[PDB]
Amino acid sequence: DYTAYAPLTCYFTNSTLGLLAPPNCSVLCNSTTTWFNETSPNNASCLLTVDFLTQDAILQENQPYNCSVGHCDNGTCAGPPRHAQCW
Amino acid sequence: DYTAYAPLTCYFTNSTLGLLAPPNCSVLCNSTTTWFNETSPNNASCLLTVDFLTQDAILQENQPYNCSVGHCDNGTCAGPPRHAQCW
């Protein structure tokens, strides 16, 4: 395993429009040694809103839900929103 | 662990200028279910060349090495090159 490849694991939301960055276009990542944020690239798909009854998350319900998707614009998620299903 | 975050692990080269995409600006990634390539964003740091005696890699030597770094431009790594150390 000479000069082995460097894995980077980053954490997204699953959706019908693919993996989404958060609304602030900053993704949590982990190298072999560290946890840090990386700014999403401009035009990456990002979560704008999540559209379920707030109490469902308080009850930690493990069910898919309606969400809206935008694109990253200079470190913030921008609309106009598109519909998607998130889980 | 309700609607758990979706991890994506992608594989880079370590360097003194940070994690590098390959010269073709296409990164191997793994979701919880699949292996696939993702195109690097424009202006991501990428490996242009590796500057060691070819036989060293044939001998699978696990040593750091001089490399040159560029930036992704429309799916290919572009110069001008900057020096870095890779491992």
Author numbering:
A (entry chain A), B (entry chain A): 18 to 104
Task: Copy out sentences from the published article reporting this entry, exactly as the authors wrote them.
To neutralize chemokines, ticks secrete small cysteine-rich chemokine-binding proteins in their saliva with no homologues in mammals, termed Evasins. In contrast to the highly selective Evasin-1, its homologue Evasin-4 binds ∼20 CC-chemokines with nanomolar affinity. Thus, Evasin-4 binds to the CCL5 monomer and causes disruption of the CCL5 dimer by shifting the monomer/dimer equilibrium toward the monomeric form of the chemokine and not by direct replacing of CCL5 from the dimer.
Each of the N- and C-terminal subdomains consists of a three-stranded anti-parallel β-sheet core, in which the sheets are oriented orthogonally with respect to each other, forming an L-shaped structure. The 3D fold of Evasin-4 is tightly arranged by four disulfide bonds and contains a rigid protein core. Three disulfide bonds connect β-strands within a subdomain (Cys27–Cys46 connects β1 and β3, Cys63–Cys94 links β5 and β7, and Cys84–Cys103 connects β6 and β8), whereas the fourth disulfide bond (Cys42–Cys89) joins the N-terminal subdomain with the β6-strand of the C-terminal subdomain. Residues Glu1–Glu15 are unresolved in all three crystal forms as a result of high flexibility. The crystal packing reveals a large intermolecular interface of 2,380 Å2 buried surface area common to all three Evasin-4 crystal forms. This interface involves the N-terminal region of Evasin-4 that forms an extended intermolecular antiparallel β-sheet, predominantly involving strand β1 next to strands β3 and β4 of each molecule.
